[model samples]
Target: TIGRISTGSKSLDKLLGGGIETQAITEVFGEFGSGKTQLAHTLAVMVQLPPEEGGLNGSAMYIDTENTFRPERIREIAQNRGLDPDEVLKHIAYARAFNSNHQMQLLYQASAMMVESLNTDRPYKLLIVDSLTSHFRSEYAERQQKLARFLAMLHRLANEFDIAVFVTNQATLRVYLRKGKGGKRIARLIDAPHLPEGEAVFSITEKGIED
Candidate 1:
């Protein structure tokens, strides 16, 4: 049965209608230190669980544009969740998109990996692009058009494979504008196919994105 991957916060999961769903795109955006990448990190760890738990019983492919793909966070979060730290890190396919075009290329490579994973009957059920627009901002001209095509690829893959695509966008347009401090931050769902728009506030702690 198709399911979801938790953000490691029950409150966020409730707002997400049991968490980010398969066969659709879930967008999260906000100011810096707003727990965007933290949620991504948590999902990478959580998606490896079986359906009996609140996961897709799968792995993740992360195209990190902002260099937020931290293995350390994966280790801490996985260990905190009682999952093997190193094993959890292994299941997540991590890549750094050096530029806007590289982000697009990573998706192609990501597709190949998913096909390989499906050979084990545990295909990647989650694809995360933390802070989706950074690369586009780094360079753009036919930006919107390229973005539209990129988004189309995401949806096609999601629908074809029943994968949940978690993509974060910028809340503020300023480049490298990270707000100071940390604790808890809020997330608002801008859109979803079958759910009402909502918001959830969550924290980033030693235990990961917690309630």
Candidate 2:
């Protein structure tokens, strides 16, 4: 059976039906300072735990796109959770994407590393691509086809590995277009949810993301 994951926050875990679904892709989108990295950090701390203790002692395949992985923050979260910060950091393998091509390449290799790591008994229960949308947006620059390809890759990764995947997305300013704005097109390609006008907001905290 696939392992389950917690969102690190009780409320978020409840909303996610007792934490994030194992071996599935969970995407979080919000604007700047909206807790995107915060939640990502929380997941990192949680993924290293043993199964019954709300974790799998599994390793994390972390891809940092916007340079959001701070060792100090991760250490703090680990300390708060009564986990070894150094040990948690060790389980998390870091990859830095300098360009779009590099980003995709790192993603493709994430599964391979996870599988190999599992062979040694330390299975990877969760995978995190912090700010997956930034590189896509930067590389594509509002191009629909390119964005579609990006999400498709994510889909394949989730299906191939029975690993929980989480990605963060950025919200763009809505452009009032007289002739059907392309915002919908972009959103559709990224698989981002459509929120009502007044309901859009972002979050950030010391521990990281919230709502």
Candidate 3:
């Protein structure tokens, strides 16, 4: 589903290599069981997989300000994906950010690891900010301006690095949602940087998200 994706950044992308960035404001918004968190978890595993194995292969950095990240869930998905669950969990930098200070500060730690991954096998390539609404619940430093500035920082991070960005929001709040059978949650992709906009009804199986 979509809320609204307004995006940006600088010429600093050159230092990071190419200008092809991943945090292109292509965020997913969904309510509980609407599948944003599950899909967010799914991307954790998906990005680590190789082209032949699955998709984009790289580690992840998570901004779980909403506390949706569960280590146990990753175990199931990683196991189903035929990966070492423990290692997979280990590779993912899980940071529980409670507020804007925590949420805002965690980005640097994530970026450090992003650069650090370059010298290691599992290079950090995915950054997820779970629930953009959580910070707004209590945090109100002129919310819009802060978010405007914050997202720009993320965009710059994605540009300065090859990491992909996947942020999740609420379905009840301006997002359209649909159901697919017994276990599927249908979400529409809008404002995708590369892939053309379309609808995807994916299943939130025990293993993780599946088409």
Candidate No. with top TM-score: 1
Which of candidates 1 and 3 is the stronger one according to lDDT? 1
Task: Tell me each candidate's TM-score.
Answer: 0.89, 0.76, 0.81
Model 1 pairs whose backbones collide: none
Backbone clashes under 3 angstroms, per model: 0, 10, 1
Best prediction by lDDT: 1
Name the regions of candidate 3 deviating beyond 4 angstroms. 1-23, 171-177, 191-197
**Model 3 RMSD in angstroms:** 8.2
lDDT of 3 by residue, 1-211 (tens): 1111111111111211221235444466656778778767877777777745444567878788766899899999889878899888987888888787677778788777788687777777778889665786666647776676777778777767766777787611122345668876765544444443445455677667665
List lDDT for all candidates, in order.
0.77, 0.64, 0.64
Flag the better candidate by TM-score, 1 or 2.
Answer: 1
Clashing pairs in 3: 30-171
lDDT of 3: 0.64
Q: lDDT-based ranking, best first?
A: 1, 3, 2
Q: What are the per-residue Cα lDDT tens digits for candidate 2 across 88-196? A: 8888888887876787788678867867876776676677777776766766635566655766776676667667777777521221111113221111123224333
Q: Which residue pairs overlap in candidate 2's backbone?
A: 34-203, 35-203, 35-209, 38-208, 38-209, 39-209, 49-56, 49-57, 50-55, 51-55
- Candidates, ranked, TM-score: 1, 3, 2
